[PDB]
Copies of this chain bind each other. A is one copy, B any other.
Amino acid sequence: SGFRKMAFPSGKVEGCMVQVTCGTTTLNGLWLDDVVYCPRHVICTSEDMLNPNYEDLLIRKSNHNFLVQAGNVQLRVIGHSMQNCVLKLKVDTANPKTPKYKFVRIQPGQTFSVLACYNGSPSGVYQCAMRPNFTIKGSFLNGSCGSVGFNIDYDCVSFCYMHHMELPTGVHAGTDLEGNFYGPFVDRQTAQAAGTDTTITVNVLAWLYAAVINGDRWFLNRFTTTLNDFNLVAMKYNYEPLTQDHVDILGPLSAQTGIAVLDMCASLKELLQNGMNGRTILGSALLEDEFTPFDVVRQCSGVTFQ
């Protein structure tokens, strides 16, 4: 028992990080087989970052202007191309540590682990959610770009995020690994507005199931509710609406704990209307919305990877 914000084991992704330097700018790359993927602003100078024309700037670069370092080893670049907001540097050498992998574009509300890196080396790993407004609440400094977020399925690493920037409020924005930003952001040095952020209702419910599984049951009430009536109250408190697909996704938790989704909705309604009277659920004084139903099952049933 116990419930913690757990990240995926990071080893398979650690073996793929490289450093990419183009002139003065250095950031992280992802080396899979014989291609290094990295953010395109690596070709910028500080002056270029205000108003960059990336197509222009890449025209000036040769393969040899990209210094790619894997540990102490320089990888010879033999080609380069730009795909949306990422660069693909073809290199001499296939990464012998390449895991089975996929590139995925996640949906809002979905979680993933970030391996925060500087100079091609890992600093730490944490778990994040793609927020409804297509930001993530990360921890990233100068030099972190090209860090990636991922999920694992047994042996397959699904890469879903590459880091590109920080937005006025200390939240973060990035791309899938085809270079398309999540949300309406661009890789340009400006304060960019994020949409108002909402709470991920299906994840709050999943976490309430995690609480019940772990014996923290005080918040359960005797009432039930309809999906419609719950989603009204959800609107008022800036909670995403709960769809029938979400109800289906919560099915296995519901059957394991004996508590129908809609009865859990009743309890959450009360929590939103009445707050918590300075009680905690799973050690938290706030309702937590960065565990998906699958995250709850993984942790609470001991799903492993290798």
| The residue from B12, B71, B140, B306 contacting A2, defined by CB atoms under 8 A apart | B140
- A9 at interface by CB-CB < 8 Å: yes
Q: Are B303 and A123 in contact (CB under 8 A)?
A: yes
By size class, the interface of chain A is 35 or more
Instruction: Provide the bound-state CA to CA distance between A125 and B9, in Å.
Output: 6
Q: Are B9 and A122 within 8 A (Cβ)?
A: yes
- Structural contact, A9 and B14, CB atoms closer than 8 A: yes
Of residues 211 to 241 in A, which have CB atoms within 8 Å of B's CB atoms?
214-215
CA distance A306 to B286 in the complex (A): 35
Q: A150 in the interface, Cβ–Cβ < 8 Å?
A: no
A126 touching B5 by the CB < 8 A rule? Answer: yes
Partner of A9, one of B4, B124, B170: B124
Q: Which residue of B lies closest to A11 (CB)?
A: B11
Q: Would you give the shortest CB distance from A291 to chain B, in whole angstroms?
A: 12
Inter-chain CA distance A300–B116, complex, in Å, is 12
In the docked arrangement, what's the CA distance between A286 and B3, Å? 17
A-B contact pairs, 15 of them (CB 8 A): A1-B166, A2-B166, A2-B172, A4-B138, A4-B139, A9-B11, A10-B10, A11-B12, A71-B306, A118-B304, A119-B304, A123-B298, A123-B303, A124-B298, A170-B214
A123-B302, A125-B125 given; 19 more Cβ-contact pairs under 8 Å: A1-B141, A1-B166, A2-B137, A2-B171, A3-B139, A6-B124, A6-B125, A7-B7, A7-B124, A7-B126, A9-B123, A11-B15, A11-B122, A118-B302, A119-B304, A122-B304, A123-B304, A144-B302, A280-B286
